[PDB]
Amino acid sequence: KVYNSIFDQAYEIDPIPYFNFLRKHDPVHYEESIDAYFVSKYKDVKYILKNNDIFNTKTLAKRAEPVMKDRVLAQMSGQEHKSKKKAILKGMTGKYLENLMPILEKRTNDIINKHIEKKEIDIVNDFGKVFAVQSSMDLLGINLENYEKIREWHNGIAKFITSFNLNDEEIKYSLECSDKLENYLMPLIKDRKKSTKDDLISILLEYKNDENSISDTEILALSLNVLLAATEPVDKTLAYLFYNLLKNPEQFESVKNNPKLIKNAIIETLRYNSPVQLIPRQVSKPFIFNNTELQAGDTVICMIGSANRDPEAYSNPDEFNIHRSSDNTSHSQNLSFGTGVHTCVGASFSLIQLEMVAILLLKRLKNIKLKTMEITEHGIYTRGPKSMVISFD
Numbered sequence: 001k002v003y004n005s006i007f008d009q010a011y012e013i014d015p016i017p018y019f020n021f022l023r024k025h026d027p028v029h030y031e032e033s034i035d036a037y038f039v040s041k042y043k044d045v046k047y048i049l050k051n052n053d054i055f056n057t058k059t060l061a062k063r064a065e066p067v068m069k070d071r072v073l074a075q076m077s078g079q080e081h082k083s084k085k086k087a088i089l090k091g092m093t094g095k096y097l098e099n100l101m102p103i104l105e106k107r108t109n110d111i112i113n114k115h116i117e118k119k120e121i122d123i124v125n126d127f128g129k130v131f132a133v134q135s136s137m138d139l140l141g142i143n144l145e146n147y148e149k150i151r152e153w154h155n156g157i158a159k160f161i162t163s164f165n166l167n168d169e170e171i172k173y174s175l176e177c178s179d180k181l182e183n184y185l186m187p188l189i190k191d192r193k194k195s196t197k198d199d200l201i202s203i204l205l206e207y208k209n210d211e212n213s214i215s216d217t218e219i220l221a222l223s224l225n226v227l228l229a230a231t232e233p234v235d236k237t238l239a240y241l242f243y244n245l246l247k248n249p250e251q252f253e254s255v256k257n258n259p260k261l262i263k264n265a266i267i268e269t270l271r272y273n274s275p276v277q278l279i280p281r282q283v284s285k286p287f288i289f290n291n292t293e294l295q296a297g298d299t300v301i302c303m304i305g306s307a308n309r310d311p312e313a314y315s316n317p318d319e320f321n322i323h324r325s326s327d328n329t330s331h332s333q334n335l336s337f338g339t340g341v342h343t344c345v346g347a348s349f350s351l352i353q354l355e356m357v358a359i360l361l362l363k364r365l366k367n368i369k370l371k372t373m374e375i376t377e378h379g380i381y382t383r384g385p386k387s388m389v390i391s392f393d
């Protein structure tokens with residue numbers, strides 16, 4: 001019999017003691033309520049994600065396609081996945097990136113300008129959630145006139161993708177959000193293909209595979225994939241970043257005096273408070289980790305936050321330290337963007353965007369002081385603070 005469950009109320013309040021227990025005592029941990037095994041150690045998570053043929057992404061057909069309306073990038077393999085991944089990357093690199101970043105600076109400063117006279121701002125609810133959705137629409141090429149509705153519908157499909165055992169009414173609402181996004185974006189996709197622009201939607205329409213153009217619902221699904229993937233982690237990471245810096249004033253000062261450290265601080269925040277906590281895969285054939293036997297068709301769920309705090313991978317893993325280095329002590333590449341075939345295509349863009357935002361907040365909000373002295377965190381699949389208020393001059 002087992003008594004420590006991922007679904008204990010205590011886990012969502014504070015999962016760190018669970019991480020420590022599971023890595024030591026139950027590294028491949030079965031949860032009967034969802035018929036899945038949770039994998040907590042860095043070595044095992046990395047092995048699973050590096051081995052796309054043994055641990056495939058068929059789980060996503062279930063957790064995602066109902067709201068994405070067609071296949072997502074992570075469900076693809078082979079030359080199709082490689083090529084469409086490259087097509088998505090094009091939209092956040094090269095000239096597309098050079099054009100997008102001044103726009104994201106504008107989004108950042110407009111939000112700051114709304115709150116600068118108030119002398120406080122909620123990094124979660126005033127800045128992060130607004131900026132995150134606007135940035136994703138700017139990347140895709142969706143004009144912001146309806147961004148508030150977009151955010152509402154996004155939250156509904158994200159809830160579907162990040163939840164376990166939702167009830168029938170919650171499912172209904174998430175599917176209605178999906179339908180509304182489809183009803184809004186399909187007319188825009190049609191207009192885009194008869195008048196191409198310089199945005200990701202246009203790239204996807206211009207995509208050609210053996211002289212074949214993919215269906216408009218396939219475009220919609222990759223567009224929803226980008227909207228969800230780019231929006232959800234951003235408010236969480238921005239909030240955790242300023243919280244951890246304000247909780248470690250010495251490191252916050254080092255960052256002020258040396259802005260080159262902001263990139264390392266973002267990476268450490270992603271390791272320490274991983275905003276995407278879980279990555280599921282399906283087992284393709286009998287397999288064993290430690291002495292836990294897995295069968296073809298079983299589901300394994302990689303615990304990214306647990307892996308990123310594995311003492312086998314990091315010295316003093318449960319301390320926030322922006323000065324960690326492989327040149328120093330033990331240090332590894334964190335798994336916050338995944339690894340292997342499906343490594344986040346937006347990882348580099350994310351680091352550039354978050355550094356821009358953090359620079360502008362530090363430049364314009366003078367003498368930042370923490371007001372939310374103790375965060376409350378929510379979510380076990382994606383995870384972040386409910387609120388993270390700072391004050392400034």
Ligand code: HEM
Nearest residue numbers: 073074226229230233276336337338341342344345346350
């Ligand atoms: C801090 C920000 C972000 C984090 C922490 C994050 C996290 C992740 C993780 C953990 C995965 C792996 C999922 C898996 O293996 O099943 C992933 C994949 C992906 N992410 Fe991100 N993500 C971020 C931002 C973005 C952005 C800005 C985009 C913009 C398009 C994006 C698009 C994608 C896509 C398309 C995939 C699927 C990649 C593939 O299948 O090859 N993500 N992300």
Ligand SMILES: CC(C)C[C@@H]1NC(=O)[C@H](CC(C)C)NC1=O
Nearest residue numbers: 060064072074228229232233276
């Ligand atoms: C969105 C998923 C259907 C596929 C894949 N999964 C991920 O974990 C990331 C982040 C989201 C969980 C926000 N994005 C991805 O594309």
